[PDB]
Design a binder for this molecule. Structure first.
Ligand code: HEM
Ligand code: HEM
Ligand code: HEM
Ligand code: HEM
Ligand code: HEM
Lengths: 304, 306, 306, 305, 306, 306
């Protein structure tokens, strides 16, 4: 089975589109789903090989039941709100996700235009974010972002549904959250205090040794080991976004995994805390304003 | 005198920032102006040679009088509203323009962040547009945009103030208008009818011959000759922008010229018409929602400030 | 595991197509060249890596095969079959060897072609030589994007490489070539909308026409074929513009690769002879075939080991 | 005055088009001349900054008198045949030259298509050559080609008409010749013998010193000093071309200079020789089959027609 | 299932070769660094992706292996074997660890080497450090293209990676290094044709000499070796120029990877000790080896699991 | 109009600095090489255009000038002046000729240095050879961006080229070189904020510290100088990192060009001897100079006409 382009080369631009399906809009949606791969080629082919355009399409739990009869993917459920003692992960509505990536924003915008053109009258937009990466892979906090993502065979194993749910093999699960940052408070920390929040050196991107790394650092809390002592991994493609006039400085988080359990365990540790950590210190400078969960089927599923 | 980077190499990203200066904000603004070149180097130097980051700073007519106490540039005045029989060119507030360009949006954003950091508390944002060019220099209407811009020595002559106003030599005048398009109506025209609106072939960008080119086409109305029969020229760096969710598809127009009279004559022809043309047909699919005029001084003028 | 030739190439912007016939007595010289052609490709190309992207695919015709080799023949190898339609004809022309040479620059193609023909002088007669160039936005001589629906990845390997159905020749492929001349004057008299009806896709945006508006005799409708089991039958194409402005020759060199020639031949029958709903492919009313040949392109190992 | 793009950045592709103007063709030609800069922007702008498309337009001596009334450029005359003891530089017909350059052949071809589309029925093609440079600036003989071209202000001085002919300031003179090579004979020389023909090392492109450089080497014969002892220079943009099936391996020579006398002195030395050299040894492996001379006006001259 | 180190790297234009010995008592510090070297590679390289192309291949010598690890040894691991020929000698020099660092720029190599050696200060003693650079047309210091006949694709994986013959160490490889210094004055006194007879290929065009003119003592003849079954035995090389113009040091750093050391060692025997028809490889009359070491480069998983 | 050497070069990522002394009797050989060095630069560089960006700036020391030439000398040419401060010393070391070779790749630098040294063998003795590389974000070995406040355009030409104050030598410049080694272990024991107080700029973002926090003994404060008339006195720098990981050598090669040595020497006095408010430049607490030389770089025409 052929996956969607979940494992994409590095891109410097992205559009995230989240919509809800209006009553009566089901048929229009199903037709667009069967054409989205053809639209990706149409927009992208003439800008190859530099364009690097791809579109990953995801479907939410409630939407799935409205669109399709028969089997559901085993891990598909609505995003679970987390009400921590200090920080909250909100659940917000979303039926479809389009994760559009390329080397330039214009290509993203052209594909998004064709997709939304086909869905006019059948969907209501909930979120639209135009992201850009900094030229040295840094995010809005000034840290390199993406370093420990798995690659090659380890990425496929971490991200693609396999034999445990054979009808849906080659799919994946995406979690999205839009975060806004308090840059004024962040810039009041010394660089060394910032390093203790994240768990890595700022300039050189070397991980802090186990004797200095705090238990409530981002990297400590999002490091999880399975029963067999192996690392449980996700693939992230976080993107800065913002607006200088409205003082909006953000990170759009997106994490792909073979089962939502891995991502959800990381979120629980961050937001609810553990015995050794009250919460993830990154949350003292970062507020989540959306949260949604989607299944991203194999490309062949959509082509039917 | 050293000009600002009005004549930039081609760039694929831009931020347009327009602000008003709040009462009491003048001193903070004057300080920022004397540092803006240093900020451009700070952000841009480490991303050379590919980043191509530049910032052009413009000052409005009413702002100039609040900031500076001596001579005024000869052509600086508030943008003039045009009330045509069908179409209107509105005047909207703006005291400062930052026209930021680079090969990537992140560099534009980083410079804009440092600029606005210094001005917080002293200014109020009026407009912020993040522009992106299509990979084959096309605009949102699907036409190549930029082709007849002047280059080289002809660009310098058309754009930079010279001997006619010697205290302000090396400056320029910028006009900005944000346009929103009705794409549904535009896409209901055949290609040939679109070509009659613009005045050039869509796929190949070859200008229509003089015996087919309508008098109310964009190219006919923006072609102006001087007293001596020479072409009057401006330098444009129009950028697409928009939001697919809100159905906003735009062109941000910016035109630089040695004197505003050239740009204003073109706007009069577009909006008020001529003997042979009621108005520019591009305006039947394009609405202006801002309009402002700025003087962009020589770099030396900004540096030598308090 | 048998190694294919570079049938599945990255995108290239230049090509040379060379078709020759083998003279009487030339067989031994040809066999020696075949055993060296991959070594020549590395010699010319390696020092221009990684940007040169030089490759050569070598093909052998049906009659040539029997003169060169004893033993088994590939199961689908036969001479190209003439199609005599009510209006349009697909001609068969002679050719014993094909060299399909691609790179990012014409000079590299020319240097490899020079070494190959240097070795074959006196043993072969040239039948056709075409120097092809792709337009910068993947467009062909008709102004349409060309290549869009080619298969990629695993689907390309499945569509193009001989496998278990003919195990001695696994890793080979079949190439069909046709040189087309276009009537550009007639083509350019069509509106863009009428050109879109001929091809089956939008010209500027390369979006396929919806199934209810796509004509039955459009290029895309007739070259879309489904198998016994209702799966899409695919080929890999790398069509190249060519021509000469002084002689008014404006062409497309067609080359199509497939695991069996039946798929390509079915598409040709539909184009030239028509179906119940379509007399012929409308692209043929602006395009004349002046060559036609079929070749087997063996696995690289097959050529090396003789 | 704004020159044409005679001083171009380096390009790896070119089309050379030479045509003659038929009976009655003059009006159609003058219309095209007034549009050719606008055509160049139309084709090229959307492929910037990588495309690097330019077109330099030239007009021959006889054509000048048919197209324009009034002043003629001072140095404009028909190409002068040189019938030397062994080698000949032929003259062939040509009224208009279009020298089209870009980073890719397709852009050259697109501009040539629009130009010839406008001239159909008014002109007869005499030559069409599609040129390609090798990836390390080498020519068909395997030597680096271009090295001692002038650059910057020295190029402008060597190439652009100035005060000596003020009505035509910003123009230039182009000489073209199509050369075919005998590759078999060339490749039978050792590398060291080839180096003595050219006057430079093959691999490293270092000039042979004055004590080893033969008097009949290409570099010795095309090195000329003026009355003042200063170097007389031209700007060249030679391109390989050919066809493997027909065994055609060529160099298309094009040389620009402020006055044709510089280029003509070099041609005399190559074909007629000097006291110490019978002829340029490059000519024992290279045959000229075309020869024409053109004036390339300032861009504003063409625009104002 | 085993993940190899980046032995099969894309082409790179810069490299650092670091060879060190492990001091008495340094074993624990070395084991800790080995378990982190892939994490360090990502730390330095990720922010320069995708163009940085940074990789590190780590190798371990025979005597070092027994100091670091208990249990199984790779079947072909032994100290480099000195070859004392009648004229030329291949010396063995000490080395416990190899770090073969490659990228598209030297600064990335240098930054990773700095982090690695920072961790190992006090536990290791440096024996050699070479900063290599590519010529722009893949030439070495002798003026010949270097790398042409290296295997690619599936043939490279088969030639280089340990498989089922030693399943505990599958996905590893064996590296041989030798630093060579050239006598450039003697070399440049030869005619180009005499240089071609030393190497076995044409200098400018890199075309291999035909079998009847290629000398038996040419480099290409002696390093072409066929197995019992008549198949070509191959290695992967990534030779790098280095040197210092003031000290007149012009070198080639030789590095060859193979699935078993016997292939590399057979080539070395032929070069240094000769055959019945060739006393030695003529390249050695202009090239002196000043180092020689053999290393096993484990699968990436083996290093991670420490 | 006198043609300068390529002092104002585009940005380069690689360099070779070569400093030699002229042996007794070597004068004639040197004069011949000087008259050929521009021809050699084109020979090596032309075939790598337009990306190679190869250039060579040749400098002559005070004592060498008097050995090579008769007549008038440039007005500011003297041996480098030793500075003996209370804590820190600037040493003077021998050097008669400087070759400052820059390009986009090291191999081009190396090839030109090889040709230059080939012509001088037996006439000169090498004193220093450094192969420099820039970090990918223009950072130096201290981790700060390096070059940001260099002048550009017309302001650079005014700062660096001799003019009417010494008209026989117009178009020349003066270069000062110092090789610095850093104590990285001590430097890395500072916090980022303490490092920023040493340099005078923010580490990550390269924004200059405000005048109210910038210490008087920071690098940027001490190297900022105004003339009597209030104008900025500027130099043009092209500092390059270099080093060797095995020897723990981490360096910055300093080179500064100026129209008169007085500007450079005033900055050096402030750094090494201090001012009223600053004992010395804090950068020197982590940086030791081990070479120091001064050269005049003539106009290109001067070298050609020898
Ligand atoms: C405000 C939102 C976020 C920001 C700015 C952020 C930024 C970063 C940074 C700078 C790193 C270190 C470099 C790297 O390996 O990528 C990192 C690592 C990581 N983040 Fe985040 N992150 C955010 C949210 C999240 C969330 C919500 C999750 C999971 C549900 C997550 C999971 C991870 C994981 C797994 C790693 C790798 C840890 C390791 O194994 O070293 N992050 N993040
Ligand atoms: C919706 C707003 C606009 C759009 C989309 C737009 C688009 C275009 C296009 C496609 C062309 C032809 C290609 C080229 O030469 O650039 C053009 C030309 C031009 N436009 Fe605009 N334009 C707009 C507004 C304006 C305004 C407000 C002015 C002047 C005040 C202006 C002045 C010009 C000029 C001078 C030309 C060149 C005409 C020539 O000399 O051939 N445009 N525009
Ligand atoms: C004059 C010659 C030709 C021209 C200019 C040409 C042009 C094109 C163009 C513009 C397309 C649409 C975009 C794309 O998918 O590539 C296309 C598609 C196609 N052409 Fe051609 N074509 C030519 C001849 C042929 C011939 C001879 C064949 C088969 C024997 C062929 C088979 C196809 C196929 C299979 C497709 C894809 C249809 C689909 O699945 O969507 N074409 N061609
Ligand atoms: C027959 C085909 C021709 C070939 C293949 C050819 C090739 C070359 C080569 C390899 C060089 C040396 C590198 C360089 O400086 O460009 C050169 C230099 C030169 N060629 Fe040609 N050339 C040809 C015809 C001509 C003609 C017809 C002329 C003049 C009318 C000419 C004038 C020159 C000049 C002036 C130089 C520069 C000499 C100097 O100052 O060093 N060449 N040529
Ligand atoms: C001074 C040291 C060396 C130099 C400059 C050098 C240079 C070259 C050159 C120029 C080639 C021809 C083109 C090619 O790379 O395919 C070549 C081929 C080769 N060299 Fe070396 N080499 C050296 C040492 C070695 C050593 C020590 C070995 C083996 C232990 C070796 C093995 C090979 C092999 C296997 C080939 C490929 C031959 C074939 O099958 O075509 N080389 N070398």
């Amino acid at each position: 089975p052929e996956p969607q382009m979940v494992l994409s080369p590095l891109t410097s631009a992205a559009i995230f589109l989240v919509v809800t399906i209006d009553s009566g809009g089901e048929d229009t949606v199903r037709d667009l789903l069967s054409d989205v791969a053809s639209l990706e080629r149409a927009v992208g082919f003439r800008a190859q090989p530099d364009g690097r355009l791809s579109c990953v399409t995801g479907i939410g739990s409630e939407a799935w039941d409205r669109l399709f009869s028969g089997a559901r993917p085993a891990g598909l459920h609505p995003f679970r709100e987390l009400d921590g003692p200090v920080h909250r992960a909100v659940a917000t509505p979303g039926d479809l996700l389009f994760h559009i990536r390329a080397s330039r924003l214009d290509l993203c915008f052209a594909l998004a235009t064709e997709i939304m053109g086909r869905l006019r009258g059948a969907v209501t937009p909930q979120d639209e974010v135009h992201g850009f990466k900094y030229f040295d892979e840094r995010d809005m906090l000034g840290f390199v972002d993406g370093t420990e993502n798995p690659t090659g065979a380890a990425a496929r194993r971490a991200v693609l549904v396999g034999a445990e749910d054979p009808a849906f093999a080659g799919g994946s699960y995406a979690v999205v959250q839009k975060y806004l940052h308090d840059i004024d408070a962040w810039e009041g920390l010394s660089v060394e205090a910032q390093e203790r929040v994240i768990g890595r050196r700022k300039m050189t991107d070397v991980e802090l040794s186990d004797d200095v790394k705090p238990a409530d650092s981002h990297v400590a809390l999002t490091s999880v080991t399975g029963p067999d002592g192996s690392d449980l991994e996700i693939l992230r493609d976080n993107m800065p976004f913002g607006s200088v006039g409205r003082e909006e400085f953000g990170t759009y988080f997106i994490g792909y995994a073979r089962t939502p359990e891995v991502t959800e365990t990381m979120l629980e540790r961050m937001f609810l805390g553990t015995a050794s950590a009250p919460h993830d210190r990154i949350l003292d400078f970062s507020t989540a304003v959306t949260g949604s969960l989607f299944f991203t089927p194999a490309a062949d599923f959509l082509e039917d």
